[PDB]
Symmetry: C3
Subunit: 400 residues, 3 copies
Amino acid sequence: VLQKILIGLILGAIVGLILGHYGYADAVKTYVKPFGDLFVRLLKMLVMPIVFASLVVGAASISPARLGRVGVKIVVYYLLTSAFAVTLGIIMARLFNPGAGIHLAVGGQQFPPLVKILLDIVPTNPFGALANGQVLPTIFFAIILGIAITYLMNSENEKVRKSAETLLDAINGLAEAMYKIVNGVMQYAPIGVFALIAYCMAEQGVKVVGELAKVTAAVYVGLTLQILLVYFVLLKIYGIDPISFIKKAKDAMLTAFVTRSSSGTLPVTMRVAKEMGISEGIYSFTLPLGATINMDGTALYQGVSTFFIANALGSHLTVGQQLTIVLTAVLASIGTAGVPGAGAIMLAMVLESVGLPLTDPNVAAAYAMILGIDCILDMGRTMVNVTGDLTGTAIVAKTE
Amino acid sequence: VLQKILIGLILGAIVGLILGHYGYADAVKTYVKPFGDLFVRLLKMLVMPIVFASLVVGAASISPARLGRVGVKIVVYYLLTSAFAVTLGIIMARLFNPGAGIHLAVGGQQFPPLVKILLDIVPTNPFGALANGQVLPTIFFAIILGIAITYLMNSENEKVRKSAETLLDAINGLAEAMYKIVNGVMQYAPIGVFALIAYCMAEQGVKVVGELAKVTAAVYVGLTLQILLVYFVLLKIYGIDPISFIKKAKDAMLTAFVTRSSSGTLPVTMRVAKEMGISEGIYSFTLPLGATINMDGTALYQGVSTFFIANALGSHLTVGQQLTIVLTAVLASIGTAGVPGAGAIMLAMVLESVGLPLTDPNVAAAYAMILGIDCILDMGRTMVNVTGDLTGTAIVAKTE
Amino acid sequence: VLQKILIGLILGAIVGLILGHYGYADAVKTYVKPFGDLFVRLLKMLVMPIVFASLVVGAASISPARLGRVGVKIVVYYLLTSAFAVTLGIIMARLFNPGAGIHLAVGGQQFPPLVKILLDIVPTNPFGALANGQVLPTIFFAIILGIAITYLMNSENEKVRKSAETLLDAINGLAEAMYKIVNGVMQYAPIGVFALIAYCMAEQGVKVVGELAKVTAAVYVGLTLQILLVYFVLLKIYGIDPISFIKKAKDAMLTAFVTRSSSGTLPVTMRVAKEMGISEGIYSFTLPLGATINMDGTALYQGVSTFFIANALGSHLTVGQQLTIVLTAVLASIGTAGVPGAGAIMLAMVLESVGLPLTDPNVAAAYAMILGIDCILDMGRTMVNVTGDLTGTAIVAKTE
Ligand SMILES: N[C@@H](CC(=O)O)C(=O)O
Ligand SMILES: N[C@@H](CC(=O)O)C(=O)O
Ligand SMILES: N[C@@H](CC(=O)O)C(=O)O
Ligand code: NA
Ligand code: NA
Ligand code: NA
Ligand code: NA
Ligand code: NA
Ligand code: NA
């Protein structure tokens, strides 16, 4: 009966698109949107406990072989599927030509060392990192905690074996409880989906016209091809049924699509991975990493929009400019956060790499138009972002 | 032997009232007051762990019937006992006439959407909400966690039943430990009560004179009538012996009276509810909620002081304005936090409701005079605030 | 094979001292130093969980006798060994005369009630204190929690005994797991030691010359005499073989020396105390306390530098001023935090005690010179600070 999410999604996208066409976006923002916001509030509630607990228990696996190999593989999957998404976005923005009318405007006025990021992946107080919603530091600590718990259960002493067993059970009992709540809040998901889709359709409905229609088309048709030409093809190569994969991932896909936060849909994403029969050692490490590392819809978006500005500015991006886009957009997609709208902010990075700084007021003009339709683009962008998460999660799972 | 709190309270209110009448409030603030502050520090120490643990364990009950019915009942009790307390304060401030001398002054210069409060009751990181002292968000998460733990203990699998039992046991052992510390710090309570009663008596002793004596009298007599005509009567109606109820609640009453923080006296309040034989499913959820939601002494205070200001300005508050006072003071008593002094700040809200803004310097004169005696009033105010918590807690407990 | 820390330390101090003598301190700060920083990041990661868990489990001991006696003894040991370290620094700074050349400079421009510290040792939300890295408040709460758990295990009811045993096991399983991680990160310690020692050798290598060489010499020779004439002698008096004690504490000593943070080396310090056969009731409470309370190398440093400044200004510190130096530097060493550089900051306190404020630009000249060589001093300073922790920890352990 949970397929009523589509019922809540489809006709919900209509009632908002109607009211917004009569100056009722304020009525949606005052009555309808709070319900969909509450849905996101409930989803964010479960992220930190379900990620920490499942990954401590998920570290009940061969630490050198399993964790090391699933890591060094999924990072190569993530890097390859993101480098292919930005090239596909380039190809889309090359077949298409979103920037046609050179529209100048005035008053745009837009706008972290690597060692300072890597050294912060290792926390200095996991109680704070858990209390501050830092997923990568708590992934690191929970990996080390579960491995230490496993080493405790293999000693000759029974007291330390009994204590480690008592700790790991309570942590698993927490994880199981968090998954049951995921099912509970996913039962309310059709209402929250209906509300969040009435908004962003009553607000950013009529805006998408002209050259904005081309860039939205170029992204979405490239996003579907990313699902088909990459995920579907690579799933069949490793012998994973694509139709059944999508039939299960409908929940996490649409939840990411409507919420636009890959970190907010991670509880649903983790539960779907449990539903398809994936080892906890796999999805509890692969998915929270890919939530902030694997952004395929972002790199495609970023590769399309980076042509739209230059195409609307007359700038001719040579093959070298396209390759620097491919490289820089991958790096920007890694840094892009699992929160709604972040990809538009880090899109500046690839714009700077091609000698198109946001300082130029003419560049800031087109940038303001993209942020005016980001809500639409971000929905499908996050969906493919999480779809690639579950794809490589299942691929590396069935690789072991 | 713990009744020496009264011994520490009574003669402690004298030694401060004596020393304060000879310019020794600095000696109390430098030597005596730190002991009562440490008492509050120990009480605040236990609030977050004892509330989270006891309510997770308290969620080992029929979730639809028990929790739903105890909720929809205690919220109506809270709304009715607060709406009666503000009317009783109005009746007191009408029998009395605190504002007689129109005293003008110079240099007063005094001085959250509902959806932003309701949507904030649902946390987004329970690790942080526990680390930030947010009782309403941790109440919500602990309800859902215990229900999920109960649903885990009813599955056919033994592993998830063992893990859920392991988790719920450690949480209960934490709650039990917190209650034992409550008894330990309650043994030191007579000293902290003696110290906190030397202060506010050495500081705010002779201050209460004239119109200040009238408004303080009208408040306390309404608070006693609220205790007698409401709590005692409704206790007897539901077959609860009032005298034995007071014999149980003596600890939480004097602690709330002395501490003035309903959230700081909540550990003592929770222990008293256990001692009088209440199930955790009832009191462990009702009390922390009512600590911040149910404030009857606040609504009575606010209903009395809002008359004193208008009476000291000559403005005639019509019967319609008196009804808006009843409504707004209830809302302000709901929003008032369980920390000392919040009710005087939330009095501004009902003052705005009657067209008496704090911007007007004549309004700021009487407002600053009320804040100059708030300490004394706040003591009895918090006492009735927690008394109404324990009253309805026992009523709805014996209703099941 | 872990003795390769010395291999990483010794020749590591050379490769930095070489590269730093050719303008390659930036190459060390950009490539070498991040490795030693990561080592400190991993060490800080374990401090809060291993201290809370081990001390809750360590509270499984006779609370009045054991904890009370180990406390009232180790606080007297700490006060005596710190009062002797500052006198030894005075004797060193009197045998030596670091301040010889009165060097005036321009542009120095340098630069908490006791009740507010004591009352802050008692937390008001242990979830926050754990999430904020506050070791003294979590020490207090963990003492009270473990004692309450012990009182729970001695009741006639079996349910509360089972829950308390379930809680204490999971906490012990956490402590054991943290100790296993301490061994894991201590295996990486030789690399982090090699990186942190190449730094402050490439940075502060040639700097120590002249009066800087004299004050640094006076500090270290007093630190060694503090180790020999105090620790070694008092160990032998209480029947502890000094050579075997060093063979155990070699890890914590070199880690403290290299990290300069007594709180960052506390996990290694706690593990060494376990390896040398100390009950958790003693060391797990004594060590985290002494980490921030017992700093003998700090008081010696402060006693030496306070002479160097006055000697570089010509002011004659009388015997009475020398006694106030002893007292205030002990207080400054008590208040000094377990983070690198705090002792130089707390040196201002004893400088104010002798009428030598940092406001005087001539005082700020010598002060800036001491802060220009504080890094090396701090290395040996922290080493003796933690050495005195483990010394008295073992003494009071074998006293029970
Ligand atoms: N919505 C994306 C971020 C973005 O595309 O800006 C995510 O949460 O992963
Ligand atoms: N002292 C009250 C608040 C107030 O009266 O301002 C309470 O904590 O409930
Ligand atoms: N490094 C010392 C502080 C100092 O000497 O400044 C410590 O952490 O204990
Ligand atoms: Na993602
Ligand atoms: Na990303
Ligand atoms: Na309130
Ligand atoms: Na209350
Ligand atoms: Na100190
Ligand atoms: Na120390």
